[PDB]
Amino acid sequence: SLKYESLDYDNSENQLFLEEERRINHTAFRTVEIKRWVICALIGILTGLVACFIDIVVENLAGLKYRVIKGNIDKFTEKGGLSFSLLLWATLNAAFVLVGSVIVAFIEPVAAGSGIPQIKCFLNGVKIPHVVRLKTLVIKVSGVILSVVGGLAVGKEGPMIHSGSVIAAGISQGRSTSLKRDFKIFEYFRRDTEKRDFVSAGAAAGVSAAFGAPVGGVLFSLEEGASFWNQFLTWRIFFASMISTFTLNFVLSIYHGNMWDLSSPGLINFGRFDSEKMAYTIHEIPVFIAMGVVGGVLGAVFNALNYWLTMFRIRYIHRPCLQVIEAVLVAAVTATVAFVLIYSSRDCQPLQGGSMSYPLQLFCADGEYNSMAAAFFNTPEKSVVSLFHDPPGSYNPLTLGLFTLVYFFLACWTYGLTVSAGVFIPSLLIGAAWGRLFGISLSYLTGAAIWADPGKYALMGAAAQLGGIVRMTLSLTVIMMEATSNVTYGFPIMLVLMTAKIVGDVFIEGLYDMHIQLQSVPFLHWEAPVTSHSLTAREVMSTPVTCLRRREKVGVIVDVLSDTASNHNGFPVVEARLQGLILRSQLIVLLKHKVFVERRLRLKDFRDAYPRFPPIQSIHVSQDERECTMDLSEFMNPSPYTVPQEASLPRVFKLFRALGLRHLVVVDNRNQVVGLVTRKDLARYR
Amino acid sequence: SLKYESLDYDNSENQLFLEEERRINHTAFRTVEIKRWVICALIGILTGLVACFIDIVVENLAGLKYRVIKGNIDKFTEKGGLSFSLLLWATLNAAFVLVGSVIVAFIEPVAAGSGIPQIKCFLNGVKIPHVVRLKTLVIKVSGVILSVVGGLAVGKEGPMIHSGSVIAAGISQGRSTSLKRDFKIFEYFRRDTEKRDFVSAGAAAGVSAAFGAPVGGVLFSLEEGASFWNQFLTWRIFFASMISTFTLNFVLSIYHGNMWDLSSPGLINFGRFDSEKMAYTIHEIPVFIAMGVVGGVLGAVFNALNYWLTMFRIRYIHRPCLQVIEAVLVAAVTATVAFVLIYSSRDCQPLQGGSMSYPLQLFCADGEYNSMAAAFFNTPEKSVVSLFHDPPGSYNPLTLGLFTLVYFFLACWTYGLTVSAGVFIPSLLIGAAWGRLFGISLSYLTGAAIWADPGKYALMGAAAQLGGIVRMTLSLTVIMMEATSNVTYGFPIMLVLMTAKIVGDVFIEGLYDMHIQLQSVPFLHWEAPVTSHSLTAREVMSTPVTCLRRREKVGVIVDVLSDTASNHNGFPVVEARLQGLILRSQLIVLLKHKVFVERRLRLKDFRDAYPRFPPIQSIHVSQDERECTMDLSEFMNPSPYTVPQEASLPRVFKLFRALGLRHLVVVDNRNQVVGLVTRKDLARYR
Amino acid sequence: LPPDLPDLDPECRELLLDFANSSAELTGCLVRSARPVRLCQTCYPLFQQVVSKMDNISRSCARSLLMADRMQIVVILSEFFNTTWQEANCANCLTNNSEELSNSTVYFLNLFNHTLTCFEHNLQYSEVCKNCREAYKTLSSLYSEMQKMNELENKAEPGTHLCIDVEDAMNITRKLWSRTFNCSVPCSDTVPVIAVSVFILFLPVVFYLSSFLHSEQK
Amino acid sequence: DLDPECRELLLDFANSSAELTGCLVRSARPVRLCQTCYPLFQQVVSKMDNISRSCARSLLMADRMQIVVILSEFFNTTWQEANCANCLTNNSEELSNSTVYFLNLFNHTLTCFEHNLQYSEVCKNCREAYKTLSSLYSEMQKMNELENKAEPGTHLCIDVEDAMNITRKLWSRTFNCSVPCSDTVPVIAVSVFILFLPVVFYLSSFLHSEQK
Ligand SMILES: CCCCCCCC(=O)OC[C@H](COP(=O)(O)O[C@H]1[C@H](O)[C@@H](OP(=O)(O)O)[C@H](O)[C@@H](O)[C@H]1OP(=O)(O)O)OC(=O)CCCCCCC
Ligand SMILES: CCCCCCCC(=O)OC[C@H](COP(=O)(O)O[C@H]1[C@H](O)[C@@H](OP(=O)(O)O)[C@H](O)[C@@H](O)[C@H]1OP(=O)(O)O)OC(=O)CCCCCCC
Ligand SMILES: CC(C)CCC[C@@H](C)[C@H]1CC[C@H]2[C@@H]3CC=C4C[C@@H](OC(=O)CCC(=O)O)CC[C@]4(C)[C@H]3CC[C@]12C
Ligand SMILES: CC(C)CCC[C@@H](C)[C@H]1CC[C@H]2[C@@H]3CC=C4C[C@@H](OC(=O)CCC(=O)O)CC[C@]4(C)[C@H]3CC[C@]12C
Ligand SMILES: Nc1ncnc2c1ncn2[C@@H]1O[C@H](COP(=O)(O)OP(=O)(O)OP(=O)(O)O)[C@@H](O)[C@H]1O
Ligand SMILES: Nc1ncnc2c1ncn2[C@@H]1O[C@H](COP(=O)(O)OP(=O)(O)OP(=O)(O)O)[C@@H](O)[C@H]1O
Ligand SMILES: [Cl-]
Ligand SMILES: [Cl-]
Ligand SMILES: [Cl-]
Ligand SMILES: [Cl-]
Ligand SMILES: [Cl-]
Ligand SMILES: [Cl-]
Ligand SMILES: [Mg+2]
Ligand SMILES: [Mg+2]
């Protein structure tokens, strides 16, 4: 809780910053804004290419795995020995997950999960360690490939958000700290204000690549940032989202041969809902609301079981060796349960044009292939698309019901494993499954009425279950709208997402918020809780405040920084009349360069130590230098944001969240410092 | 310039506000947020119904007019006397525009134009008089119907934004000031903070109804508000946009008979671009960029000619009688130029199914209609759709070229008329016209290559011309994306809109910004101009400041308010140590109720006089009461937003715009009031 | 083996062979009536025969003949004939009994023949355009009237096509009348149209100039 | 009306399309489309191409209801959907050897069924005749992917596909001759053991932290 440090998003408009901006504007054309667009274009291209790499590698590797499994099953079907096929399937699942779990559990635990909670925290302004490191990106991409190829009930769309953010946070700096390679470009953007803006473009680019929803990506980053409206930043964020989904579409079209067919804007492509079958009446609106109630209830059950499982894993399965074993066991069980359902499945159908990628004939007539095998052998994206677009009567309720019940618990069990994997697609698949079952039941109860199309209800179920689990409403609705390419479907999708969140919020919080809370991250919500409007800044502020004089003794500065009882990173500058705000990182740079009253530092010198500032212990100061004085006038933030003692908490919370502040100085009516507000002071209210 | 007053968007968290919020939470259930959703639903429904009313009435009235004109032309084609048909067409055009111009020029001049600049100003925080009055809505709806039926080169989609805002600003108050009818509901929302939020929902609902772009409507209101991110407000804004486009779709389907066919989400429906013809390659990207250059250049010419015409009309055609005559003359000329083009058109073709409702045979073979007649007899929405979706040999370049040249100047001439009319559709039609001509030229230069589909280039031309005229980029791109129901088209549409704005901005500002400037409205842009970081709050603030003591004499308050040299509406409260801020409207209420130090006022008492507060002249105070003292502690805003004297202009501008402030107090190091910042202080920098 | 899969069931062999020649005769008649079109006046016995035979073959042979394989020839051939019949839109040119052509249809062909034979003896095209005009106008007026009847009795949609044979017959007359015979109606409306249009277009010039000159001196 | 020397390609196309429609119906329930009237389809195609080679303008696009064009489109669509091109060789003049090879194995398998009909004898006498027919059907399904660069393996010559289905319905639905070996007990034991592993892992981890 106390080990998480906030971003320095609010740029300190000190004297050095003013000279640099003045110098830039006088250096002929100002190319800062142009470079922002170039970086955003590169962020979108690279994020799209990463999605291309994941899609191509997974398709080839999973194709090889399923061909091997199908061939082994075919050989042993009539001659006997199918138990070896089960062992081969389980071993192949374990082998891929073993590599995927080891690299996450032993090399970079921060790559576990989808990474969306980590990115949500980063755009919230709080830094989780190692989120945007190069090693994290490599393991996240490699881990998600091994997780999907490993047969886990997971999705690869979710991790794209984390992958895009890491690319954004590294490309924009024009250097690689991990590789110790510094390209002499983009040094201007080596600051927290620019980095968070680029990460929002990267996260938006990841959403657009994952779902083919460039506008949904923008609204995701806008929701998580929750900042003041920045027209030029939002335009650049949309620029990255548009390029990301286009790069994925263009490169995949080349890989698939048909360069003229841009039919793959995202990793998952819902298809076309522009049909008479895909039309709804006003009488179906109460039915859709009821589906959102089911999605909220099932999502709450999904989140409640995962919370209990996560508590168990934190208590008992925290060792890396046990984490690897747990992921391997889940992979073997996932194959085993799938094999058992396929083995005992007595329903098979003739092969359609593309219904089954690897049609498995097992114990039923020639020319027919096991229907339950298609549910497990097909990629979850294909299963979701088929559930969306299939003629009525395509699914036997028993085999679809058994798959839904099993996949629900498998996805819940698999989430929280020490592997890189997403939960978006599994939640979509679960909802599309019981949503289709709801449509089948309605068709049975209405005599196969044309309005009771199971495919349409699969879309509503998928939205209801996804909303019931992750509690995303505005970005999710637009993502669904863009994926279906049908504006009119927004109205039912919005309604089901509203009731799914409302019903789900009654029982438990969302999956992403649940895991952020379990990590004790100081996460700021959109507004202060309703039960805290009676509070003022005086009740929430921290007092007394450790301040520094405008002309402060070096020994005093060192003693304040060297104190081990606390690790404050911001210090108001007083004369206790407030004059400004100085950061710990700024003080370290000043001490390192020995800037004492007794050539001149530039803003680049402070960016040279960014983002890994040396600790105070690395600073060696002599007794003679301890008596020297340091003038903070040219380096402090001369106009820190302040609130009166009597300012209400919602006013304090709104200003802090919107501006992305790290330190908010509380003053009395005489401009005397009386308290300090940081994110931990605001996040403690629930 | 000095007659425009800003909204009181920043709620004054005085003592009375705190008690009211405390009392509301004391009840069993807080229904304030629920009522916000109910109002937003009503805003969307009524905005959709208004769009339904406009669409149905225009279709019936324009159908009657064109049947009469076609029947008269057919009768006189062979027997002679076609000059009477021209006179009948001109007279019918003049008659409808005469009524439409009179109600605008003589009853409500604020209803002239699309109303988008007025709504842009309202969401900017500045109130144009009579924008959200009931009479304005009636004239706007009636005027746009008469304008479209009157044959003017205009569109009805644009005025929907203004119409939705008026509904939002009146329904949310639960009363009608114009009709003197007070329903005892929604009294809590009778404040500027709630009204501006609802108007943003109304403006978004208007965009969604106009174009079938609910997400585009949200981004339009978000762009114009440019405030801190409000998740619950944005969710409600999307709620209104979704309902507005659904209500229009549902009611129109009932009117058209096929209730199970929701094929009309907007007033204009672009159609389907999900075809192989509607596909692009990366070689066309430079070609699309070149089209945006044309759109920017032509848009600049369109705006430059309109600015010169607007200056002429302001100087010489400002009288209401001359304004009515000018609109009537434009209507007659529009019919006359159309008749001449139709009369001399040698291009005619067979009826290829649908494509029109009034096929005009004039001087060529039986079974063939005059081609140029279809360009003028068809509604501009349907002409745009045909240009988007037509076989590559549908249009004669000379016939389409002559229409484009004439309609370009007619639309430019007509825009500034004293009529209620939009410019979105005419700009779309112009761009779709020369965009199609560009596609025809490309097909001629590439041997009818499959990638050179004229319909695809009509879409790019329409975006390029619209972007070149109104300079909308982010909302417009999403509107185009939703209208075409194709995310992959977002990438070329984004690129053409970027270069259209960039090229256009080199020569002249956008049409909406141009007319806001010509009205001398204090409009705040998204950020301060390039000469911002060199300026501080001291150089932009107004000094000296008229302040009031916390316990102030009544005579002093009256003299300050009764001063005629200025009309300040906000006064810092000092003890010159800042204590708070008090509004002129608050002071008038305090004086009216005679609350003196010498039953207690509630926040409802201040809302009772909202929004038409009586002037200070209506306040009668005696000499005995002038010596009484008024305590402002319970009524002032106890925590007004403040900036230091040395705070940079971008920091001052960002805080002022994001929070929707009206008064920003500048303080020195000792919290002494040294200046005041209002929108006029910030808007004067260009 | 059962006489269903490898070889034809005897009760279904003659029914399929009944469909074979009936569809063969419809296909042969459709092509011969293609140019100029006489489809739904010559192929209407051969089309209802196909529909009845398909009806007689489908409600113990419907199960085994229609959906017995992937390529349902009988179904798609009936679909093709139905699509061709409806695209020709001759259901509106036949009576409710559908046993023969309607009176409006029969009325159109015979005076279409009257117009055609009127064209014949006026060649031996100055003579054709002179006296053989009333015959053309009543043919054209009837076509518009029949179109209007289709818009009220059938009330389907504006621009709905009539039967192709009637539409083709009108087209041949129009191509003969306006492309080869060159029967054109001169118009003397140019000068009055120019004068009225020029006067109207001069009004904004006067209005703007007079408004400018009025404000030039108060 | 057209010239008599022009209304003979139209008349030739009439009876040729009449005879193609004649065969398409009487060769439908037992599908022999690509073997019975592959000439009669080529006769229609050739006679239509003769019009394309002074009758094209006056017979193909001379009116709204282009009967000749749509009829040729229907035959082409039926030909392509039936995949009769795979059913012959490249030159499209006679049945390919593989189709003839499959057809006589189809005849041989059906001959085997009659011999052992007079279902116990059928399953255990010419079973290998069924497997070699099924194995061959999978062989041509595979080379079809590589010969014409088809993405999936979906549909061969409809006569071949119908013939294989006829055998499969007889071999599986009429008679129950198929027998895949179901190792139910070994599958249960292996599956139960694997599903019991997470129970042990979680319980042992719980019982190890307890008592430290
Ligand atoms: C198929 C496509 C594949 C995609 C290829 C790019 C993958 C990538 O971007 O990988 C991230 C990598 C930074 O990864 P690094 O781990 O090397 O650096 C971290 C550091 O670790 C953190 O520090 P932390 O806060 O945890 O303590 C800090 O927060 C972070 O901002 C980084 O700091 P910078 O060094 O960038 O300033 O970007 C680079 O290589 C750019 C090199 C060239 C750029 C010039 C191009 C114009
Ligand atoms: C349902 C539950 C609620 C009960 C309904 C409330 C009645 C109502 O709505 O009345 C009309 C409404 C106010 O229009 P009004 O002109 O009567 O009132 C202005 C005043 O004029 C301005 O004052 P201004 O700032 O210029 O000085 C002020 O700024 C403004 O906010 C208004 O003030 P309110 O009286 O509302 O508080 O508008 C409209 O058209 C609505 C269209 C009705 C529906 C359209 C049919 C499809
Ligand atoms: C259940 C079917 C329909 C879906 C397939 C999923 C199962 C293979 C997974 C999902 C949830 C898992 C369970 C989640 C939690 C636990 C509790 C765990 O610990 C205890 O039972 C002891 C706890 C204590 O002593 O406090 C033992 C494993 C078990 C049953 C797990 C075993 C494997 C399960 C059943
Ligand atoms: C790609 C470009 C460089 C092509 C140049 C083509 C020129 C022949 C035309 C096309 C656009 C025209 C411009 C469009 C708009 C304007 C703004 C206009 O400004 C005003 O009258 C209003 C100024 C104000 O708002 O105060 C002056 C003419 C000008 C420069 C026009 C001058 C003639 C231009 C450059
Ligand atoms: N200079 C300071 N003087 C006194 N209290 C402080 C100071 N800075 C922070 N605090 C308070 O100390 C507590 C711990 O916060 P912490 O020391 O982690 O802050 P930080 O490092 O400045 O900021 P953050 O952790 O949000 O990035 C909080 O309640 C915070 O308000
Ligand atoms: N109380 C005040 N004392 C001194 N100057 C003021 C005061 N209020 C406003 N001004 C200044 O007077 C000028 C005219 O503004 P005006 O009087 O119209 O302000 P207002 O009515 O308070 O606000 P607005 O017009 O923005 O709604 C501006 O430069 C403004 O900064
Ligand atoms: Cl995660
Ligand atoms: Cl996922
Ligand atoms: Cl996820
Ligand atoms: Cl306007
Ligand atoms: Cl418009
Ligand atoms: Cl407009
Ligand atoms: Mg800290
Ligand atoms: Mg004012």
From Swiss-Prot, chains A, B:
Outcome, altering A209V: In OPTB4; uncertain significance
Record site feature (Mediates proton transfer from the protein to the inner aqueous phase), residues: E224
Main location: membrane
Transmembrane segments: 37-69, 84-107, 133-151, 157-174, 232-251, 285-315, 320-342, 397-417, 422-445, 489-507
Chain span(s) of sequence motif Selectivity filter part_2: 155-159
GO BP of this protein: response to pH; transepithelial chloride transport
Database matches in PANTHER family: CHLORIDE CHANNEL PROTEIN CLC FAMILY MEMBER, H(+)_CL(-) EXCHANGE TRANSPORTER 7
Site entry (Mediates proton transfer from the outer aqueous phase to the interior of the protein), positions: E157
Motif Selectivity filter part_1 per record, residues: 113-117
Residues that, per the record, bind chloride: S114, F424, Y512
Catalytic function, reaction form: 2 chloride(in) + H(+)(out) = 2 chloride(out) + H(+)(in)
Effect of L134R: In OPTB4; uncertain significance
Protein role: Slowly voltage-gated channel mediating the exchange of chloride ions against protons. Functions as antiporter and contributes to the acidification of the lysosome lumen and may be involved in maintaining lysosomal pH. The CLC channel family contains both chloride channels and proton-coupled anion transporters that exchange chloride or another anion for protons. The presence of conserved gating glutamate residues is typical for family members that function as antiporters.
Membrane topology, record value: Multi-pass membrane protein
Pfam families: CBS, Voltage_CLC
Annotated motif Selectivity filter part_3, positions: 422-426
Protein name: H(+)/Cl(-) exchange transporter 7
Family: Belongs to the chloride channel (TC 2.A.49) family. ClC-7/CLCN7 subfamily.
Residues on Cytoplasmic side: 508-686
Residues involved in ATP binding: H568, N569, G570, T678, R679, K680, D681
Gene name of the encoded protein: CLCN7
Intramembrane segments: 116-123, 198-210, 214-222, 455-469, 470-472, 473-484, 485-488
Effect of R236G: In OPTA2; uncertain significance
Tissue: Brain and kidney.
Keywords: Antiport, ATP-binding, CBS domain, Chloride, Disease variant, Ion transport, Lysosome, Membrane, Nucleotide-binding, Osteopetrosis, Phosphoprotein, Repeat, Transmembrane, Transmembrane helix, Transport
Subunit structure: Chloride channel 7 are heteromers of alpha (CLCN7) and beta (OSTM1) subunits.
UniProtKB/Swiss-Prot annotation, chain C:
Alphabetical GO biological process terms: osteoclast differentiation; transepithelial chloride transport
Coiled-coil spans in chain: none
UniProt keyword annotation of Glycoprotein present: yes
Transmembrane segments: 193-213
Sugar-bearing residue positions: N21, N56, N82, N96, N103, N113, N171, N182
Keyword Transmembrane: yes
Lumenal side: 1-192
Keyword set, alphabetical order: Glycoprotein, Lysosome, Membrane, Osteopetrosis, Phosphoprotein, Signal, Transmembrane, Transmembrane helix
Subcellular location: Lysosome membrane
A cellular component annotation (GO) from this entry: chloride channel complex
Membrane topology annotation: Single-pass type I membrane protein
Description of post-translational modifications: Undergoes proteolytic cleavage in the luminal domain, the cleaved fragments might be linked by disulfide bonds with the remnant of the protein.
Assembly and interaction partners: Chloride channel 7 are heteromers of alpha (CLCN7) and beta (OSTM1) subunits.
Known role: Required for osteoclast and melanocyte maturation and function.
Medical condition linked: Osteopetrosis, autosomal recessive 5: A rare genetic disease characterized by abnormally dense bone, due to defective resorption of immature bone. Osteopetrosis occurs in two forms: a severe autosomal recessive form occurring in utero, infancy, or childhood, and a benign autosomal dominant form occurring in adolescence or adulthood. Recessive osteopetrosis commonly manifests in early infancy with macrocephaly, feeding difficulties, evolving blindness and deafness, bone marrow failure, severe anemia, and hepatosplenomegaly.
Family statement drawn from the similarity comment of this UniProt entry: Belongs to the OSTM1 family.
Protein name in UniProt: Osteopetrosis-associated transmembrane protein 1
Span of the entire protein shown here: 73 to 310 of 334
UniProtKB/Swiss-Prot annotation, chain D:
Glycosylated residues in this chain: N15, N50, N76, N90, N97, N107, N165, N176
Subunit structure: Chloride channel 7 are heteromers of alpha (CLCN7) and beta (OSTM1) subunits.
Stretches in topological domain Lumenal: 1-186
Disease field: Osteopetrosis, autosomal recessive 5: A rare genetic disease characterized by abnormally dense bone, due to defective resorption of immature bone. Osteopetrosis occurs in two forms: a severe autosomal recessive form occurring in utero, infancy, or childhood, and a benign autosomal dominant form occurring in adolescence or adulthood. Recessive osteopetrosis commonly manifests in early infancy with macrocephaly, feeding difficulties, evolving blindness and deafness, bone marrow failure, severe anemia, and hepatosplenomegaly.
Family (UniProt): Belongs to the OSTM1 family.
UniProt keyword Kinase, yes or no: no
Gene: OSTM1
Transmembrane segments annotated in the record for this chain: 187-207
Keywords for this protein: Glycoprotein, Lysosome, Membrane, Osteopetrosis, Phosphoprotein, Signal, Transmembrane, Transmembrane helix
Membrane topology: Single-pass type I membrane protein
Highest taxon listed in the record's lineage: Eukaryota
Post-translational modification as stated in the protein's UniProt record: Undergoes proteolytic cleavage in the luminal domain, the cleaved fragments might be linked by disulfide bonds with the remnant of the protein.
Location of the protein in the cell: Lysosome membrane
Protein name, UniProt field: Osteopetrosis-associated transmembrane protein 1
Cellular component aspect of the GO annotation: chloride channel complex; cytosol; lysosomal membrane
Functional description taken from the UniProt entry: Required for osteoclast and melanocyte maturation and function.
